[PDB]
């Protein structure tokens, strides 16, 4: 069971830096390339570069020669990358990826780096209660700083007729996104609804029952 | 670098047909192409690596050709599940270079939107702030028209609205619109409406709540 985890997404000033981290379990990342892509939102796939783990050679997109670092910690099984003088346009998510040669067999989850000046918010997240044989509630998830915010339902479980929105901007710059889920009128009254908001920037874990 | 030109951008085209994906290097790549899906919030997912090899695990009905600087993926009979965006990818030499992409949206049959309109919770009421919430759910096609009314005034520049990615399996959007207004506002009037249009309503169709009721 091969896996890639990433972690040291989030919020950083313009200027500052980015210090991702992609830790492999299944297999030892010595036998492959790891190498680096990244997506800014609604765009495309970016190759950023890759190590070779066994001697810690590297090769960098000629964009990000100058202020990117991909390295590796054979003993932690770790693939890293780091990049400085941070901008804008480096907003995106980031992914790890092993390469067989061949192809890219296994990818990491990806983690979102926002750019920003703007100061970390954490969200409030409010009920939309249930007013014929189909009934929908939902929760909203309001003014939260910077993307993403997960939301899920009974602790991930249910997913049938869940849709959870793309979040928008609101006038104040702060985020605003709705979750809701269809369920048969009758449910309504014979199980409870939980709608799970995480949001990572703000250590904001909050379960919200959606009751009529 | 060497440059990727996929063609075209996007495509829509219904259950079982065939789609033809095309993408065009700068410079020679000598067969050092592959092809990647990626579905909404997802990594990539490779589907024909070396211009021409299906990936273990990938159905059939996809397929890769050429060679020198034109390559083509060709998906045989098109299925929902295959709603996504395709990249093609040069790792003939460094740095490796992906195409724009290409967006393929599925075309199914005219579904009308079920409507459902949310008041504000009483939480969220503690504050300054109200907002209305209105769900258009599972239609087809994208386009629809969503209007907000407060005592039964048309609204206009106070609401915001988002659309899921298309289902990957029905095939079908869902949007949902919010309108936004201070909570003094709220409490003064009676009746929130919104009202949609759309290809599958004869008429526009309109839910709405009185405020206390």
């Known amino acids: 069971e091969v896996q890639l985890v990433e972690s040291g997404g989030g919020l950083v000033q313009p200027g500052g830096s980015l210090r991702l981290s992609c830790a492999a379990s299944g297999f030892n990342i010595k036998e492959y390339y790891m190498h680096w892509v990244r997506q800014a939102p609604g765009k495309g796939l970016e190759w950023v570069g890759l190590?070779?783990?066994?001697?810690?050679?590297?090769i960098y997109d000629p964009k990000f020669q100058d202020r990117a670092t991909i390295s590796a910690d054979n003993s932690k099984n770790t693939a890293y990358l780091q990049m400085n003088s941070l901008r804008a346009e480096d907003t995106a998510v980031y992914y790890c990826?092993?390469?067989?040669?061949?192809?890219?067999?296994?990818w990491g989850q990806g983690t979102l780096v926002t750019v920003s000046s703007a100061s970390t918010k954490g969200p409030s997240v409010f009920p939309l209660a249930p007013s014929g044989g189909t009934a929908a509630l939902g929760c909203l998830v309001k003014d939260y700083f910077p993307e993403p915010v997960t939301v899920s339902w009974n602790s991930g479980a249910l997913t049938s007729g869940v849709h959870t929105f793309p979040a928008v901007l609101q006038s104040s710059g702060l985020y605003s996104l709705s979750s809701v889920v269809t369920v048969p009128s009758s449910s309504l009254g014979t199980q409870t609804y939980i709608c799970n908001v995480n949001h990572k920037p703000s250590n904001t874990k909050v379960d919200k029952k959606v009751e009529p | 670098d060497i440059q990727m030109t996929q063609s075209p951008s996007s495509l829509s085209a219904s259950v079982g047909d065939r789609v033809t994906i095309t993408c065009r290097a700068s410079?020679?790549?000598?067969?050092?192409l592959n092809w990647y899906q990626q579905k909404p919030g997802k990594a990539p997912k490779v589907l024909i690596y070396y211009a021409t090899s299906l990936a273990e695990g990938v159905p059939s009905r996809f397929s890769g050709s050429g060679s020198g600087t034109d390559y083509t993926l060709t998906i045989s009979s098109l299925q929902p599940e295959d709603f996504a965006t395709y990249y093609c990818?040069?790792?003939?030499?460094?740095?490796?270079?992906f195409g724009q992409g290409t967006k393929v949206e599925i075309k199914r049959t005219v579904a009308a939107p079920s409507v459902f309109i949310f008041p504000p919770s009483d939480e969220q009421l503690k504050s300054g702030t109200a907002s209305v919430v209105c769900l258009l759910n599972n239609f087809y096609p994208r386009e629809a028209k969503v209007q907000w009314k407060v005592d039964n005034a048309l609204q206009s520049g106070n609401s915001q609205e988002s659309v899921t990615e298309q289902d990957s399996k029905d095939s079908t959007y869902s949007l949902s619109s919010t309108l936004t207004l201070s909570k003094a506002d709220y409490e003064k009037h009676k009746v929130y409406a919104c009202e949609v249009t759309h290809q599958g309503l004869s008429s526009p169709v309109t839910k709405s709540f009185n405020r206390g009721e």
């Open positions: 990818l040069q790792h003939g030499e460094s740095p490796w270079t």
């Open positions: 990826a092993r390469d067989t040669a061949a192809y890219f067999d296994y």
């Open positions: 190590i070779d783990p066994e001697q810690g050679n590297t």
């Open positions: 410079r020679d790549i000598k067969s050092y």
